[PDB]
Scaffold this active site. Structure first.
Site, PDB file in Angstrom:
ATOM      1  CG  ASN A   1      38.912  44.711  33.902  1.00 32.09           C
ATOM      2  OD1 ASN A   1      40.121  44.710  34.150  1.00 32.09           O
ATOM      3  ND2 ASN A   1      38.009  44.203  34.737  1.00 32.09           N
TER       4      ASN A   1
ATOM      5  CG  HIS B   1      43.027  42.598  36.959  1.00 35.17           C
ATOM      6  ND1 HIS B   1      43.066  41.993  38.199  1.00 35.17           N
ATOM      7  CD2 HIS B   1      41.722  42.809  36.680  1.00 35.17           C
ATOM      8  CE1 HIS B   1      41.834  41.845  38.649  1.00 35.17           C
ATOM      9  NE2 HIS B   1      41.000  42.332  37.747  1.00 35.17           N
TER      10      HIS B   1
ATOM     11  NE  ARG C   1      39.446  40.463  35.448  1.00 43.10           N
ATOM     12  CZ  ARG C   1      39.688  39.205  35.808  1.00 43.10           C
ATOM     13  NH1 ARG C   1      40.226  38.359  34.937  1.00 43.10           N
ATOM     14  NH2 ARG C   1      39.453  38.797  37.062  1.00 43.10           N
TER      15      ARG C   1
ATOM     16  NE  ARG D   1      38.890  39.498  43.958  1.00 43.02           N
ATOM     17  CZ  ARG D   1      38.535  39.902  42.735  1.00 43.02           C
ATOM     18  NH1 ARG D   1      39.358  39.720  41.706  1.00 43.02           N
ATOM     19  NH2 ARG D   1      37.348  40.482  42.546  1.00 43.02           N
TER      20      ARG D   1
HETATM   21  C1  A3D Z   1      40.789  46.124  37.416  1.00 45.03           C
HETATM   22  C2  A3D Z   1      39.864  45.499  38.435  1.00 45.03           C
HETATM   23  O1  A3D Z   1      40.271  44.918  39.426  1.00 45.03           O
HETATM   24  C3  A3D Z   1      38.361  45.574  38.261  1.00 45.03           C
HETATM   25  C4  A3D Z   1      37.466  44.968  39.242  1.00 45.03           C
HETATM   26  C5  A3D Z   1      36.067  45.066  39.018  1.00 45.03           C
HETATM   27  C6  A3D Z   1      35.543  45.741  37.877  1.00 45.03           C
HETATM   28  N1  A3D Z   1      36.492  46.312  36.971  1.00 45.03           N
HETATM   29  C7  A3D Z   1      35.958  47.008  35.782  1.00 45.03           C
HETATM   30  O2  A3D Z   1      35.496  48.294  36.251  1.00 45.03           O
HETATM   31  C8  A3D Z   1      34.497  48.763  35.329  1.00 45.03           C
HETATM   32  C9  A3D Z   1      33.259  49.237  36.048  1.00 45.03           C
HETATM   33  O3  A3D Z   1      32.600  48.118  36.745  1.00 45.03           O
HETATM   34  P1  A3D Z   1      31.215  48.440  37.436  1.00 45.03           P
HETATM   35  O4  A3D Z   1      31.181  49.761  38.115  1.00 45.03           O
HETATM   36  O5  A3D Z   1      30.799  47.247  38.241  1.00 45.03           O
HETATM   37  O6  A3D Z   1      30.265  48.567  36.170  1.00 45.03           O
HETATM   38  P2  A3D Z   1      28.834  49.167  35.933  1.00 45.03           P
HETATM   39  O7  A3D Z   1      28.037  49.074  37.112  1.00 45.03           O
HETATM   40  O8  A3D Z   1      28.273  48.558  34.645  1.00 45.03           O
HETATM   41  O9  A3D Z   1      29.100  50.700  35.674  1.00 45.03           O
HETATM   42  C10 A3D Z   1      29.951  51.133  34.594  1.00 45.03           C
HETATM   43  C11 A3D Z   1      29.287  52.499  34.393  1.00 45.03           C
HETATM   44  O10 A3D Z   1      29.988  53.311  33.372  1.00 45.03           O
HETATM   45  C12 A3D Z   1      29.059  53.984  32.582  1.00 45.03           C
HETATM   46  N2  A3D Z   1      29.549  54.353  31.292  1.00 45.03           N
HETATM   47  C13 A3D Z   1      29.561  53.693  30.088  1.00 45.03           C
HETATM   48  N3  A3D Z   1      30.054  54.402  29.103  1.00 45.03           N
HETATM   49  C14 A3D Z   1      30.388  55.594  29.703  1.00 45.03           C
HETATM   50  C15 A3D Z   1      30.954  56.743  29.154  1.00 45.03           C
HETATM   51  N4  A3D Z   1      31.302  56.941  27.857  1.00 45.03           N
HETATM   52  N5  A3D Z   1      31.187  57.814  30.029  1.00 45.03           N
HETATM   53  C16 A3D Z   1      30.862  57.736  31.395  1.00 45.03           C
HETATM   54  N6  A3D Z   1      30.290  56.604  31.960  1.00 45.03           N
HETATM   55  C17 A3D Z   1      30.077  55.562  31.072  1.00 45.03           C
HETATM   56  C18 A3D Z   1      27.838  53.102  32.506  1.00 45.03           C
HETATM   57  O11 A3D Z   1      26.704  53.873  32.100  1.00 45.03           O
HETATM   58  C19 A3D Z   1      27.767  52.543  33.927  1.00 45.03           C
HETATM   59  O12 A3D Z   1      27.002  53.335  34.837  1.00 45.03           O
HETATM   60  C20 A3D Z   1      34.312  47.592  34.286  1.00 45.03           C
HETATM   61  O13 A3D Z   1      35.063  47.866  33.083  1.00 45.03           O
HETATM   62  C21 A3D Z   1      34.837  46.401  35.059  1.00 45.03           C
HETATM   63  O14 A3D Z   1      35.284  45.349  34.220  1.00 45.03           O
HETATM   64  C22 A3D Z   1      37.868  46.233  37.152  1.00 45.03           C
END
Ligand code: A3D
Ligand code: A3D
Ligand code: A3D
Ligand code: A3D
Lengths: 328, 325, 328, 326
Positions: free
Chosen positions: C131, C186, C99, C162
């Site tokens: 992240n 995290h 991450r 989890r």
């Molecule tokens: C902290 C925690 O427990 C946890 C758990 C799972 C995922 N995450 C994180 O959460 C985030 C999202 O995961 P996800 O939904 O599966 O990812 P994903 O399905 O790739 O979606 C992220 C979205 O953000 C969009 N995006 C990129 N740049 C921009 C921008 N400048 N402005 C607006 N939208 C933008 C992108 O187009 C995409 O639709 C990632 O950074 C993951 O690492 C964190």
């Protein structure tokens, strides 16, 4: 820090069977903080403690409190549900039970509560339950002074609920999928609209033609709907129905609190619809965040109009009597 | 020692819709879930993620991935099948067609049905794989289950779209809009504009009252017909899955809890409209005995014409599959 | 008439897997109107249509809309949940997924979103998901300018969820009755507090003494908890976890919107806890209508303090790096 | 078409305040078909009609029916929740209210019900509510003959719920996140385990040190918990608590019907816990699809042991009294 998102607050003015039951639904669903008010002291505090215990059992967090003054009960109420009053006339046979007989006992109580709503929460949404329903909503409207879209009476959702349960049993379908409506005044002159019954929008006439139910059966169901309240009074021995009345009032409050815009028949202010003015009567309406957002006018055929007119006469006569007898 | 066993729902296909249905089950504590797919690894990832959801939302159901038909299907109270493809490889979005998916989705559905026959012949089968009405028949033939124990999810989704558009037009909750689409899931589906009601009240009075116009309702019916392609065009890849999943699970729940909800879906025709030995979308009652009623609405001239085209399309696809094998 | 009760509004900034899944929970539960915003054109509109259709299927009424400008997406938002950003570094093997590697790709995005929140909805409650979580919550706090009690990051509810599922399976009890918490940052340095595990408040040590679980079994559960995120990344092949992350963020948003005051570990601002200042890290906190209303300081033993100190050192180093590289 | 998936059926034996309230929860949640049975005629039919109307209002579909014969009420019941009996002793001042005094009137009622469960639904899960609780569960046990894991009494989830609500108020957190347990005999001798109070698993001791609540406050909360039932009886004037008791009993029934395996303190059959045998007393247990799946024995400190022994003495005296009566 400073509170930014405040829970909704619903005041139950009247903490008897229906009031306590509605408090229960609020605690069970984490819908709103609840205040229980009644002229009988002690009892609301007992129910408030019991209901507060429910929140732990069902893992929710709302505050349930008894309040003894109108000021403490009404201040800050997003919605006020009024059930204060009598259910049966003391010293009268259940066979002679009539909601209209309650008029002389309940009009003064409803008027007093309205005067207090005007003073403490003039911006609230008022749902009246106290019988005779349509008459009491008008009394409440005049006393409280709230905008006509911010007050209604619960009755037809319950009558329609009964109508739907009986039809659902006859057709072997979930009542979620039976649309059956009762309009008019809540009493012997209510009008169960048999012609309008639908099953997920499909005309009931299709089920008659298919041989699943007959017209006779449907008219018997309509008559059963009309006498359902009295049937429960006779079976219970003391008091009247409360589980479905409470669920109906809270469903209406929830449509308001969450701006759901559900179509629920209820006693609403008439400003021309069906040709009526300056009165409340049960009609289909849309309940949303702005209160009663639409009053639906259905086309009624000859017989339906005749039945509805009788309903209109009952309530207009009673409203005139109440106006005639009102203390200055 | 076990007296009350949880219901078990097997998701045969763990792609977008399969995982989403597993989510609804975990969120509502509806049933234990098995995720099965031909793709290795992915179902294990989703099963883990979904098992984590149960803690977050305080429910307790088991979510597991299984790669064998025997493990996935044994003990399944309901089997929801989404196995197959969503779009033709190397084909433009403007050319997207559900009928072009008939190729091998047909062999996939037949194999699954053969395994249901072997491992859970008393299950209730809900098919989702396109071309829907065609695949339900393939599934029925291969599985051998009673005709009341199999149906296809399509019309509840189409009807849900129809309802949302009418609800927006009237400014009411879609809970209170009864609108139905019947026929075959595709360009030939039949939105029953005539039968739209608002809590049982005829849409005709709302037209007279000026709340909505006849042209506007026609536009809504047309929008309903092309809603799937609209979502496909917007997503860029894949097709709708949130509403399709919610519709399939609503159907499964009506069966599992014997609710007797009236839900349009692809059902077996035992003479309705003069149709036999085929499945097509019609309003039905889903209860603990499976499909307990199929409603044969009176169609107006336009609806009859449209429905006949829906029927022609289905019978032609069924003819085509009979040609393949 | 005039609107009195307005539905809550939640803005999903980022409409990928987690954003869409959170929109789904809102529609399924009639929790709030939803706006889906993303830099990718088209996709949010497709998901918003799909989600709007869900409301009919499940009988709820909320508005789900895609918005392509920050102003339209953020104005009036009661809560903003930010998932915008990358999940994996392009071209890097799943075996080396980290991450922290996402830091140079996501810091600018999070800063930009915060600058827009500052202008369009300064009174919102911000829940960051992007992240590397604890680092991003700090970037969002500096950029958005919101009070420190109105910003937090979702991570530890997921890690704890989890942890709880694995323990619940080991004991054959519902996870509702397993209280297991992960604190810290995290990532690989998160700290699953095995010593604190309780079953409806009863210490896990008694279940060991009575032969239900072993010490090694619990150590392996803690290890499994730490590697769960990567385990899912490796199984999925593309993307990372989204169902539980979405449910956790929405649970947190609901505790704020409904002033539930649930005790949920999340990335919160430190003002003295463990001698920590001017930073965010995962700790137990109370989330209510005033945002983060309390941050709980647990007594840590020698080994726990050592593991937690490692978490602290990692995030402080990264926070310094991020600040050093921030565009002027 | 042959029915493949049948709805669960819960029989409420006793259709008074708690019985009707539990039927309400079943209708509201579409949990199961409901049968309301009572010796009083009319009333159950009235409540059944009212509850059937609720299903339409909240869009659920379960059958609610009144049945006047044991055969019709009990046949096919997956779970039987028994509230039949008296709440107060006729002509007895509220200031003298005592669950123990109800024994002579309710013991025969419970034994009759148990004999009928044996005859009509021996495979059911029995949840007893009638007071004096721990004593009545033993009576039910002897009369019904069901497996020892298929019978329990609801009391401690309610007492723990009260306990949790007061601690939640003192700490300003949701009671979902307060784990507080009361064990022992439901009455003035119940044992609220202060030492075992946790806030999402975190020891209450740290909250005392942080100054959120005082040790004196926690003891006052334990006392309030013990007298909560009587506090409500006093305020109500007639009858006793019913909303939380009903929710507790249904939560237990739901953990059984959906095999949830929740950890809920309740009156369970003792096979040697604390040297207790052939009796029921309130203890932490796991309720799942196989009924009581685990009974948890907690280590008690000196004070807790002393209080628990008083609880044990209380119920042993009641069971001795019953054996003497019938
Ligand atoms: C902290 C925690 O427990 C946890 C758990 C799972 C995922 N995450 C994180 O959460 C985030 C999202 O995961 P996800 O939904 O599966 O990812 P994903 O399905 O790739 O979606 C992220 C979205 O953000 C969009 N995006 C990129 N740049 C921009 C921008 N400048 N402005 C607006 N939208 C933008 C992108 O187009 C995409 O639709 C990632 O950074 C993951 O690492 C964190
Ligand atoms: C319209 C409809 O569908 C419907 C259905 C069922 C009952 N009701 C009516 O609803 C009302 C309440 O029924 P219920 O709850 O079963 O009755 P009940 O349990 O008797 O409670 C009414 C309560 O109001 C209290 N009360 C009396 N006077 C006052 C006063 N001046 N101020 C505040 N509280 C007061 C009274 O002490 C009691 O606790 C009755 O009028 C019923 O007829 C209407
Ligand atoms: C009728 C209706 O309303 C509707 C709506 C939306 C989608 N669908 C259809 O539903 C299906 C699934 O859609 P989706 O989930 O979005 O698609 P997608 O996400 O691609 O998942 C389909 C899944 O099935 C898997 N699969 C392929 N072959 C097999 C096989 N032999 N055995 C088991 N699994 C296999 C495949 O690996 C993938 O994980 C498609 O055929 C869609 O066209 C129908
Ligand atoms: C353990 C616990 O936490 C708890 C809490 C609250 C009440 N209770 C007890 O639960 C019981 C029910 O309380 P309630 O519902 O409020 O009381 P109440 O409303 O009086 O209902 C008891 C019902 O049982 C009926 N009944 C009496 N004898 C028989 C019989 N032989 N067969 C069938 N029905 C009969 C009686 O007619 C009445 O309708 C009482 O014994 C209470 O003391 C226990």
């Amino acid at each position: 820090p400073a509170l930014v998102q405040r829970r909704k607050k619903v005041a139950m003015i009247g903490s008897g069977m229906i009031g306590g039951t509605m408090g229960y639904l609020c605690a069970l669903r984490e819908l709103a903080d609840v205040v229980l008010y009644d002229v009988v002291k002690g009892m609301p505090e007992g129910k408030a403690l019991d209901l507060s215990h429910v929140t732990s059992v069902v893992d929710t967090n709302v505050s349930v409190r008894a309040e003894y003054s109108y000021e403490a009960a009404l201040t800050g109420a997003d919605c006020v549900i009024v059930t204060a009053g009598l259910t049966k006339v003391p010293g009268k046979p259940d066979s002679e039970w009539s909601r209209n007989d309650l008029l002389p006992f309940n009009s003064k109580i409803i008027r007093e509560i309205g005067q207090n709503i005007k003073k403490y929460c003039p911006k609230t949404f008022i749902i009246v339950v106290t019988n005779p329903l349509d008459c009491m909503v008008k009394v409440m409207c005049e006393a409280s002074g709230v905008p006509t879209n911010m007050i209604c009476g619960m009755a037809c959702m319950l009558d329609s609920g009964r109508f739907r349960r009986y039809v659902a049993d006859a057709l072997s379908v979930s009542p979620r999928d039976v649309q059956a409506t009762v309009i008019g005044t809540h009493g012997d002159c209510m009008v169960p609209l048999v012609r309008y019954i639908t099953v997920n929008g499909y005309p009931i006439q299709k089920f008659i033609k298919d041989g699943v139910v007959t017209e006779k059966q449907l008219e018997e169901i309509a008559e059963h709907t009309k006498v359902s309240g009295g049937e429960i009074v006779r079976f219970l021995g003391q008091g009247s129905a409360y589980y479905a009345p409470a669920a109906s009032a809270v469903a209406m409050a929830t449509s308001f609190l969450n701006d759901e815009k559900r179509v629920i028949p209820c006693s609403v202010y008439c400003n021309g619809e069906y040709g009526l003015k300056d009165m409340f009567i049960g009609l289909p309406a849309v309940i949303g965040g702005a209160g009663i957002e639409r009053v639906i006018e259905l086309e009624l055929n000859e017989e339906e109009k005749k039945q509805f007119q009788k309903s209109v006469d009952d309530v207009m006569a009673l409203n005139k009597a109440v106006a005639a007898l009102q203390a200055p």
